[PDB]
Structures are given as structure tokens and as C-alpha cells.
Amino acid sequence: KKVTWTKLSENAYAYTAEGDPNSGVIIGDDSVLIVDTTATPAMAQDLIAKIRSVTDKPIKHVVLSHYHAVRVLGASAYFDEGAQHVIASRGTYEMIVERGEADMKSEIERFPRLFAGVETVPGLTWPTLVFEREITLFLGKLEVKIMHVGSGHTKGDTIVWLPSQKVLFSGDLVEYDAACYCGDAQLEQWPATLEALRALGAEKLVPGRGPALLNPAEVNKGLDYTKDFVTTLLAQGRKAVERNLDLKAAMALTREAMDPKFGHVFIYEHCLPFDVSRAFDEASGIAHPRIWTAQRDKDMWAALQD
Ligand SMILES: [Cl-]
Ligand SMILES: [Cl-]
Ligand SMILES: [Zn+2]
After folding, report:
1. Can you list the positions of beta strands (E) in the chain?
2. Which protein residues have their CB within 5 A of the ion that is ligand 3?
3. What is the domain-level CATH number for residue 45?
4. Which domain holds residue 30?
5. Into how many domains does the chain fold?
6. Binding of Zn(2+): at which residues (predicted)?
7. DSSP reduced 3-state for 306
8. 291 CA distance to ligand 2 centroid (A)?
9. 277 C-alpha to center of ligand 2: Å?
10. What is the dihedral of CA 61, 63, 68, 69, to 10 degrees?
């Protein structure tokens, strides 16, 4: 299992594991902050190990970039390492309340291998600190901004921004070598959210998965790609709705435009059915995402195949 621990700047690191989402790490004067937890407390052990190869400081703050189980269910591992708060936006908190249980069951059923040692998961991760717009932590002298600048990947998407070093942890708002999972997306709002991230002027950006982007040209390529992906996806959904297509026809129409431009990115085929399904709903006027459950997955595959 290939693990990559990348020092991005004086105080910022990215943690990547083959096939897993990225986690972000900020080492402040007094304490460590992480962005997303890895999928289980058993998997969190190796992120802790990487952090402890650098510092003995308490892992005081655990930020959830959004509510999805793979991002949050490792949170309880960090208590013994010094966690004082699990931080989430109001939107993320609302999603945990509304569909945390359903999403936990859904994600573990879909991709059990993402949840190594799933028996170590104690239950849902409940934030202890919920913010509306923006909080700033001073880790000694190090300023860390935790911000909701708009929704996209989910209602409540949260970013972590290190202004002094221009390091942005985008959660799943930004991708580059992988497709966007849009099953819970607010597709209409995502382009404006991407432009808000562009206005930050990041020199380093940790995307949802894959290697970090290490200069502004790479940052903007990731922003442009993600914007193109989610704009095209929603546009094809509006076309399917205008034409009264069923889901199989909507998938074929979406592929017309998405496959040439994006068909090469990692996990494209895994994500595309959920993306077409969400785009069709949202274009149909379902602004708040339907909840994904096993029976909805089953009906989706049935509609797409036979
Ligand atoms: Cl606030
Ligand atoms: Cl449904
Ligand atoms: Zn996600």
C-alpha cells in the first residue's frame, strides 16, 4: 500500500495513500491540525505515525472538509493524540444529522476496501465545534483559516487556508487527476465556489485525491479542470431533462460530452453513474440532493443496464 507524505511548505504536509482520499496536516507552533481523518481509526494510525515522525505536538484540531464517511470516521483515533475539537461547518453538521448514518452504510457497502479495519469505527463522527462562515486559529503565531466559501461537492464544503504560505486544502471541492464524485453535489453553486478559491491565490493546493498541485499554474489547471467537469456535467443533465430522457439515455448523452474531455481521469467510471444521476435530479429542480442508499444504487444500476 503506497503511502506518500509530502512536505508542501514550512508548516504544511499532504498525506496520500494509494486509492484513498488526501488528508492535510498543518504543524503549528503549539499543535497540529489535520484536514480529514482517513476512513477508519485503524487507517488513522498511519497518518498519526507520519505526523509523529515530525513532531510530538498534540493533534489538537480535526477539521472535516465535508460529511462523507471516508473523510470523517477516523476522527476518534486523534483523541488520544490530543484532539480538543472536531470542527465542521453548519452545512456539514446538518448533513451528518440528516444522512450520516445512511451515508456511512452506503459508502462502506460500495467500497469496503476504502474502510480497512472498519470494525474500529465506533459510530458517526459528531463535530464539537460548528461554525457558520469562517474561523481563524492561531497556532501560536501561525494563522490558519477554516472557511466555508460556498458549496459544491456537498452542502457545507470547508477549506483550510494557510495565508502566510499560500497553502489551500480544498477537500473534494477541487480535483485534478481524478473524477469528481458528485452524488451529493450542489452543482449549480460549484463554479462560483471555485472562483472564490481561485481568488485566494494559492501556491499549493491539496485536492481531494492524487498529488498536490505545487505552483499557481498547477493550482489554476486543477480549478479550471474541476470547473469544466462540473459545468459540463450539469449542462448535460439540463439537456437530458429538456429532452425527457430516462437515465440510460441521460448517461449516453452525458458521455457524448464528458468522455472525450474527461474519460481518462482516475475513478471516472466509478463516479459517472452517480454523477449523471445527481445532475439529472438537480437539473430537474431537486436542489437538495436525494439521499443515497443501497436500494437507490440498485435502481440506478438497473436503469442503466436492464
Ligand atoms: Cl463563523
Ligand atoms: Cl431515488
Ligand atoms: Zn466526498
Report:
1. 3-7, 12-17, 23-27, 32-35, 59-63, 85-89, 129-131, 134-139, 142-147, 159-162, 167-169, 204-206
2. 68, 172
3. 3.60.15.10
4. 3-305
5. 1
6. 66, 68, 153, 172
7. coil
8. 8
9. 9
10. -10
